[PDB]
Design a protein around this motif. Structure first.
Motif, mmCIF file in Angstrom:
data_model
loop_
_atom_site.group_PDB
_atom_site.id
_atom_site.type_symbol
_atom_site.label_atom_id
_atom_site.label_comp_id
_atom_site.label_asym_id
_atom_site.label_seq_id
_atom_site.Cartn_x
_atom_site.Cartn_y
_atom_site.Cartn_z
ATOM 1 N N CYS A 162 -11.409 0.956 -6.992
ATOM 2 C CA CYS A 162 -11.226 -0.391 -6.466
ATOM 3 C C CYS A 162 -12.497 -0.887 -5.760
ATOM 4 N N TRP A 211 -3.015 3.168 -3.537
ATOM 5 C CA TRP A 211 -3.029 1.924 -4.281
ATOM 6 C C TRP A 211 -2.462 0.825 -3.370
ATOM 7 N N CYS A 212 -2.898 -0.426 -3.595
ATOM 8 C CA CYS A 212 -2.194 -1.571 -3.057
ATOM 9 C C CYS A 212 -2.390 -2.737 -4.040
ATOM 10 N N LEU A 251 -10.317 -4.356 3.361
ATOM 11 C CA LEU A 251 -9.153 -5.142 3.765
ATOM 12 C C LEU A 251 -8.448 -4.570 5.001
ATOM 13 N N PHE A 252 -8.763 -3.328 5.372
ATOM 14 C CA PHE A 252 -8.112 -2.630 6.468
ATOM 15 C C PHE A 252 -9.176 -2.201 7.492
ATOM 16 N N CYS A 255 -11.479 0.876 3.449
ATOM 17 C CA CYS A 255 -11.104 -0.240 2.579
ATOM 18 C C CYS A 255 -11.463 -1.505 3.364
ATOM 19 N N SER A 260 -3.799 -5.538 -3.861
ATOM 20 C CA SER A 260 -5.142 -6.098 -3.900
ATOM 21 C C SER A 260 -6.105 -5.332 -4.776
ATOM 22 N N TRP A 261 -5.619 -4.269 -5.448
ATOM 23 C CA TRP A 261 -6.483 -3.485 -6.319
ATOM 24 C C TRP A 261 -7.259 -4.426 -7.235
ATOM 25 N N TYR A 271 0.823 -1.208 0.000
ATOM 26 C CA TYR A 271 0.000 0.000 0.000
ATOM 27 C C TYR A 271 0.848 1.245 0.000
ATOM 28 N N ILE A 291 -8.037 4.652 4.110
ATOM 29 C CA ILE A 291 -7.056 4.768 3.036
ATOM 30 C C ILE A 291 -7.315 6.078 2.310
ATOM 31 N N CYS A 335 -7.236 3.723 -5.373
ATOM 32 C CA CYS A 335 -8.275 3.210 -4.470
ATOM 33 C C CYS A 335 -9.689 3.577 -4.936
ATOM 34 N N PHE A 381 -12.797 -2.764 -3.258
ATOM 35 C CA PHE A 381 -12.765 -2.840 -1.801
ATOM 36 C C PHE A 381 -12.882 -1.466 -1.132
ATOM 37 N N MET A 382 -12.889 -0.370 -1.899
ATOM 38 C CA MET A 382 -13.058 0.938 -1.260
ATOM 39 C C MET A 382 -14.526 1.083 -0.834
HETATM 40 S S1 SF4 Z 1 -6.315 -0.420 -3.822
HETATM 41 FE FE1 SF4 Z 1 -5.876 -1.604 -1.930
HETATM 42 S S2 SF4 Z 1 -5.996 -0.040 -0.273
HETATM 43 FE FE2 SF4 Z 1 -6.975 0.875 -2.041
HETATM 44 S S3 SF4 Z 1 -9.165 0.389 -1.814
HETATM 45 FE FE3 SF4 Z 1 -8.293 -1.286 -3.117
HETATM 46 S S4 SF4 Z 1 -7.720 -2.881 -1.696
HETATM 47 FE FE4 SF4 Z 1 -8.059 -1.012 -0.434
#
Ligand code: SF4
Length: 83
Positions: free
Chosen positions: A46, A74-75, A63-64, A61, A77-78, A19, A69, A43, A48-49
């Protein structure tokens, strides 16, 4: 100034996922995650946002859990925001 619950650089999961709060200081090109060319990934686009968590540029996010975020981050897992 990042929120008090922003994801930080010695968060183990943040390291593992590479990340960064600024996608322009990320390794998105190296990972080549599918669905968009890497320069277009951050993000905000993405899956997961979490649009309903946080405020402004600082959003959830999945995942967190418990954190925020940056929408311009970016990470690895995008994953494309598909629904
Ligand atoms: S890119 Fe990574 S940190 Fe950003 S929203 Fe997606 S999964 Fe979460």
């Amino acid at each position: 100034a990042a929120p008090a619950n922003a994801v930080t650089a010695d968060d183990p999961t943040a390291i593992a996922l590479k990340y960064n709060q600024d996608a322009t200081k990320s390794e998105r090109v190296a990972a080549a995650r599918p669905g968009l060319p890497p320069e277009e990934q951050h993000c905000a686009n993405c899956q997961f946002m979490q649009a309903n968590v946080g405020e402004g540029d600082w959003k959830g996010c999945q995942l967190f859990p418990g954190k925020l975020i940056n929408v311009n981050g970016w990470c690895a897992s995008w994953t494309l925001k598909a629904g």
